[PDB]
Amino acid sequence: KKWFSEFSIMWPGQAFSLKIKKILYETKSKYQNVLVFESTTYGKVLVLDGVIQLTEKDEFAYHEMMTHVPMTVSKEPKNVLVVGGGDGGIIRELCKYKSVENIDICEIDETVIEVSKIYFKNISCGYEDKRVNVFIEDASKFLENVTNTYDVIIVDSSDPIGPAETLFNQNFYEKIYNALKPNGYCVAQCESLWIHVGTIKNMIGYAKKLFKKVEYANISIPTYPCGCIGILCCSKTDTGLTKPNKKLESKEFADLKYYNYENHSAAFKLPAFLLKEIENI
Amino acid sequence: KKWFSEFSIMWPGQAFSLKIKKILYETKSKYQNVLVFESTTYGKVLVLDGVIQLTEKDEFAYHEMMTHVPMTVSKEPKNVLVVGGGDGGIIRELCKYKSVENIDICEIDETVIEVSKIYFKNISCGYEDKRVNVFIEDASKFLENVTNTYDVIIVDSSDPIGPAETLFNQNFYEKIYNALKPNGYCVAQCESLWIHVGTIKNMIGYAKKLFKKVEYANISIPTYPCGCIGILCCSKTDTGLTKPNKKLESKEFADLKYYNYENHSAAFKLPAFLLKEIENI
Ligand SMILES: CSC[C@H]1O[C@@H](n2cnc3c(N)ncnc32)[C@H](O)[C@@H]1O
Ligand SMILES: CSC[C@H]1O[C@@H](n2cnc3c(N)ncnc32)[C@H](O)[C@@H]1O
Ligand SMILES: NCc1ccc(N)cc1
Ligand SMILES: NCc1ccc(N)cc1
């Protein structure tokens, strides 16, 4: 048995590895290299341009926290946009809210969707929901063109090298601002406090040029580099996203494996050094 | 340049790797294999039996949280025992409390101490403190024999395979109980919620057979497996260790890089699935 290893200039000097039970599918799509394997201990794994995007064992931690943070703060969210997220995990979590009327997803690479429907059936099951509408386009252009405004936008992107390069700049954050309702919320994958503090500061800086309240929360997930991933949180009201306005008690949420009411606020209690770096932006 | 890789039957199917700038020292001590290298991005690294024990870039997260959790809850701690901890990082953090009168350390392998004094000078600097007394012995025997009782015991062990095998059993926890003051606290390295839940349950079960209040807290640290490490927390009073009784405001604590008042309590807000596994023990 061989091993998959995740090396990158975005985290030089380190690498994480998973033992391969069997390769399931590889291809070169119009945007990126796509790989899918069954690991010996983390179940199935999806890779894009050499970088791990999810595994069945732990994806629930990142998908539950990116979704339920903003969706327990938003009072009555009707219309939600997912940027990126071809795997469908966010969408799966959004579907659990009966009151949601529409879920748009803008994903640049339809191969990701198709591969996920074929190889990750418990992650892509929400595509079946009649409220979901798929657009295959660069979200940088989609957000320049869209007529609707959203109650919540969840930016489930890949990393800045590759097709997501258009999603980590000031201009993208203006477009997010303009496409949210006046009391709307954005959350965005914002990388690892252990090694990407220069990025994190830039992103916070971009977001603060527009939004009243910009916060940062941290998620424990073994299969992203350094064992964790941040959520950059944007709010038009001074109140922000650390405090849920509701509990998730109905039967659609019984199965939740990471998120709960308490760890929502916990996730925003950051390490001393990050606070010190962040203040003064 | 070669890479160091951390493979183990304690985390099958995964491995974490660091790029090696230069090997500094290797030996076979009476208890274990010892390796020290300078990494390209994490600074210097100490390995024992193929397993990473610390790196200069991140050790502060594990050393600050294991120490300051219990030391902000203990009202006036006079006498503290460190089990394991040859590197001296706990001791470094303990020395910052002026009111501490004595710090005992029981480490089985003196080579670890010596290597740390030579190669990790900002981690071992606390050995110079006149309050510190070193015993070279298996802590399982030391705790059977010691006459003093402690206000706080910090069990900074290596993993269960190797010489620390005597420290992950019921009998060790009775010895810890008997060597604490009647209002005394123990904290112990208790592994990763992502992959060691069977262990975590056993340890909680051992601790609950004796202690009034057993809690579990989680630390984000990129260089342990799965990106995180737990602290098993033992308390003789129903009040427990989630809430600090003091703030660390004096000049000896200004330099702290992870711990603060808020993230003390945050660290005990665990993922939904762990709560579900833990309840009923
Ligand atoms: C896998 S979840 C992350 C997803 O982000 C998608 N992605 C990257 N860049 C963009 C973009 N500019 N617009 C929409 N989706 C993107 C990737 O194709 C990937 O499927
Ligand atoms: C490096 S911090 C962990 C330390 O635990 C020490 N250790 C392992 N087993 C025992 C034991 N039974 N008693 C004391 N120290 C131990 C190891 O030698 C190591 O230096
Ligand atoms: N789309 C989530 C994600 C997070 C971190 C990394 N590296 C890649 C994907
Ligand atoms: N002594 C701290 C420690 C924690 C986890 C592992 N694996 C090894 C050492």
Residue numbers in the entry:
A (entry chain A), B (entry chain A): 41 to 321
Please quote the authors directly.
Spermidine synthase (SpdS; putrescine aminopropyltransferase) catalyzes the transfer of the aminopropyl moiety from decarboxylated S-adenosylmethionine to putrescine, leading to the formation of spermidine and 5′-methylthio­adenosine (MTA). In this work, X-ray crystallography was used to examine ligand complexes of SpdS from the malaria parasite Plasmodium falciparum (PfSpdS). The active site of SpdS is located between the domains and consists of two interconnected clefts for binding dcAdoMet and putrescine. A conserved flexible structural element called the gatekeeper loop covers the active site of the enzyme.
The complexes with the aniline compounds and BIPA revealed a new mode of ligand binding to PfSpdS. The aminomethyl N atom is positioned at a hydrogen-bonding distance from the carboxylate O atoms of Asp196, the backbone carbonyl O atom of Ser197 and a water molecule. However, in this case the distances to the hydroxyl O atom of Tyr102 are longer (∼4 Å) than the respective distance observed for the putrescine N atom (3.2 Å). The aromatic ring can also engage in a π-stacking interaction with Tyr264, with a ring centre-to-centre distance of 4.0 Å. The binding mode of MTA was essentially identical to those found in the other structures. The results establish experimentally that the putrescine-binding site may accommodate small aromatic compounds and not only aliphatic amines, a finding which, together with the other results, may lead to new approaches for the design of SpdS inhibitors.
